[PDB]
Each structure stands twice: as C-alpha cells, then as structure tokens.
C-alpha cells in the first residue's frame, strides 16, 4: 500500500516511508491512534471537532 491510493488509509495525513510503507499522521491537537491510521484527541478540545 502507498499514499496515492485511499490516502494510504490514513485518516488525515499520509507520507511514504523509505521502505514502501505508509506513515500516517495528524494535525495539532491530535495523535496517531493504536491502529496506526486514525486520529484521536491529544488535548481536551482539539480543532475541528463537534463535542455535543
């Protein structure tokens, strides 16, 4: 798998590692989840989320 298909299954950001593997990544206020694809809050109120 690579970034050019389905954003490498990365929820937010995808980058190609030096061994033909996807390195998923997230924006400020989020961290990479246990599944190595999804993005979860790293602070109480991260950007761009509805909390209600």
């Amino acid at each position: 798998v690579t970034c050019n298909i389905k954003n490498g299954r990365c929820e937010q950001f995808c980058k190609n590692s030096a061994d033909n593997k996807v390195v998923c990544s997230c924006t400020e206020g989020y961290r990479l989840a246990e599944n190595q694809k999804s993005c979860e809050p790293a602070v109480p109120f991260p950007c761009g989320r509805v909390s209600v």
Binding site: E11, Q12, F13, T27, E28, G29, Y30, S38, C39, P44, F45, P46, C47, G48, R49, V50, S51, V52
Partner: protein, 220 residues
C-alpha cells in the same frame, strides 16, 4: 445564508461573528484562542467585537464569549483600492484569549498541499448570520449550507482564481466566514467567504495563505 438550514448548538464551534456599529456585519473563524481569520474587506480600523460560542444572537445561551480586537493584520498584498476582493484575508488578535470548550473550538488548518486536497473533495460547509433572503434581514440562528466545488471554466463565466475558487449561496453578512471541509469527522479550513451578491459564491483559497496564517498566529 440562503437555502440552508438551522445549525445545532456547538455544531460549528469555530464560527465567530463580527460586531461593529451594526451587529453581525461579517463572520470569521477561530485559528486559536487568541487569533481569528476573516476577510480583509470586513476590516476600516473601527472597534470590532468578536463573539464566539454564538448560536442565536437574540438569546443569552451562556456559551458566548465576546472579545475586542487589538491588532488587525490584513494580508500584505491586499489593496482596497484596485481589486478589493483579491487577497481577501485578514487576521484579528483578540484582547484576551478565548477559553476553548465544546461551543468554542478552533478550525484545523492543514499544510498547503492537504488544504488543497481537502478542497478538491468537492464538498464544503459555509456558515454565518448573513441575510436569509436577497434583501431580507440577518439570520437570528446560525445558518449552514453544503456547497459543491465548481470547475475553472464553469465559474469563469462572470477571477484572479490562483488564490480564489467558486462553489454553490452565501449572502451579505457571511463574508469572512469559514468554508470548511470535513474529513473523517474532523473539519479543516479550505476557504474564506469573499462574496455571493446574487443570493456562484466566490471564495478565497486558504491553501495559499496557510504559511502566512501559521506564522502570524504563533502563540508565545
């Protein structure tokens, strides 16, 4: 906004509204606790009041946070004389930080590359307390609308474009408000509302101002 629908409390917690001599004359978006992004033509110099956590401007919902603007940074290339609606983006420094919560939350801003990729998804949300009809009064409760991305040629039937795009409609009072794209339940800023007039809508491409935004809105 015309032909949209009523927003839900805390559905667009990055949305803010600008108050001057008249209430709700423009919109904006929360970049961070101390910074707002909006359209340059909304911001004259006069006393601006930013209101976050706003839902209905008539009712006191105990979610609102009013702030004074102490610094206005219109983009260096913006010139009211000449175009007026090109490089149509500004930043507002608030007097006191916003207290972030469920009703007051910033909008995510990706890098130049992904902001554009998100734009090309083809569907973004626009919102504000602009006019409900063409010459109708300003909205009481926050309105939102899903507007599709329009191609180069189709829109050109009317743009500096490089830093602008078309979709749709946004109306008077919505200017400066967010065009937002939702990716897997997280919303990213993909444009600023420039104008609609005939309530396609014309928008500023956020992608080309990301670095400028991040730089000027650095918290220290």
């Amino acid at each position: 906004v015309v032909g949209g629908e009523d927003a839900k409390p805390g559905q667009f917690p990055w949305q803010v509204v600008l108050n001057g001599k008249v209430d709700a004359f423009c919109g904006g978006s929360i970049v961070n606790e101390k910074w707002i992004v909006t359209a340059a033509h909304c911001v004259t110099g006069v006393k601006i009041t930013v209101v976050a956590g706003e839902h209905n401007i008539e009712e006191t919902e105990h979610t609102e946070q009013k702030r004074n603007v102490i610094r206005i940074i219109p983009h260096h290339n913006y010139n009211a004389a000449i175009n007026k609606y090109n490089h149509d983006i500004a930043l507002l420094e608030l007097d006191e930080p916003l207290v972030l919560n469920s009703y007051v939350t910033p909008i995510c801003i990706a890098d130049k590359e992904y902001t554009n990729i998100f734009l090309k998804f083809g569907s973004g949300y626009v919102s504000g307390w602009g006019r409900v009809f063409h010459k109708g009064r300003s909205a009481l409760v926050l309105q939102y609308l899903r507007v599709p991305l329009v191609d180069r040629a189709t829109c050109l039937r009317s743009t500096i474009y490089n830093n602008m795009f078309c979709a749709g409609d946004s109306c008077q009072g919505d200017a400066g408000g967010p065009h937002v794209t939702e990716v897997e339940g997280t919303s990213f800023l993909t444009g600023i509302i420039s104008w609609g007039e005939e309530c396609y809508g014309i928008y500023t491409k956020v992608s080309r101002y990301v670095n400028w935004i991040k730089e000027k809105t650095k918290l220290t």
